[PDB]
Amino acid sequence: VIALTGGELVYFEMDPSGQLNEYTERKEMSADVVCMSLANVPPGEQRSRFLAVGLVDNTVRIISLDPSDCLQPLSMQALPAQPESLCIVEMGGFLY
Amino acid sequence: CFICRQSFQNPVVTKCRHYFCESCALQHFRTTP
């Protein structure tokens, strides 16, 4: 998932036997972006991740981009000033 | 709602049953965390 000036935008995936493609479903999100981050699971013949975006306003946002319920925000936020960074990780033997 | 006493403009929740309107509770967090 990459952005441009704007926001919630293009995925630009690939083909599992071939080359790249895209989704033309965009939200375009009045701008508000400082950071985005995600993480991917060791299984997954599907999308199989979660989106977290950080906004210029005092807000972050997590969006599940599974094809059912795509570009639809899932749960909300609170932060005091500005994030400038995000990360998703799993560390045990809950996605932190 | 019952902070702004409006209609339920995204009546959305916190940890502990507190359903507030969305941008109004964002402004509430701007008031007190």
Question: What would you say this structure looks like, in words?
Answer:
The structure is cut from a larger assembly and holds chains A (about 100 residues) and B (about 35 residues). In chain A, about 0% of the residues lie in helices and about 20% in strands. With about 100 residues, chain A is mainly β. Chain A contains no helices and four strands. With about 35 residues, chain B is mostly helical. Helices cover about 30% and strands about 0% of the residues of chain B. Chain B has one helix at about 20-30. Chain B is globular, with a radius of gyration of 9 Å. The interface of A and B includes residues 58, 59, 76 and 80 of A. Chain A: This is Splicing factor 3B subunit 3. Chain A: It comes from Homo sapiens. Chain A: It is found in: Nucleus.
Can you write the helix and strand succession of chain B as a string?
H
Main beta sheet strand tally, sense and closure of chain A: 4 strands, antiparallel
Query: Structural class given helices, strands, pairing of chain B?
Result: mainly alpha
Task: Determine the fraction of residues in helical runs of chain A and give it as a percent range.
Answer: under 10%
Shape label of chain B: globular
Largest interface: A-B, 5 and 6 residues
- Please list the strands of the largest sheet of chain A in the order they lie side by side: 1-2-3-4
PDB class: splicing
Keywords: spliceosome, hela, bact, dynamics, splicing
Entry title: human Bact spliceosome core structure
Chain A: Splicing factor 3B subunit 3
Summed up:
The structure is cut from a larger assembly and holds chains A (96 residues) and B (33 residues). Chain A is mostly beta strands.
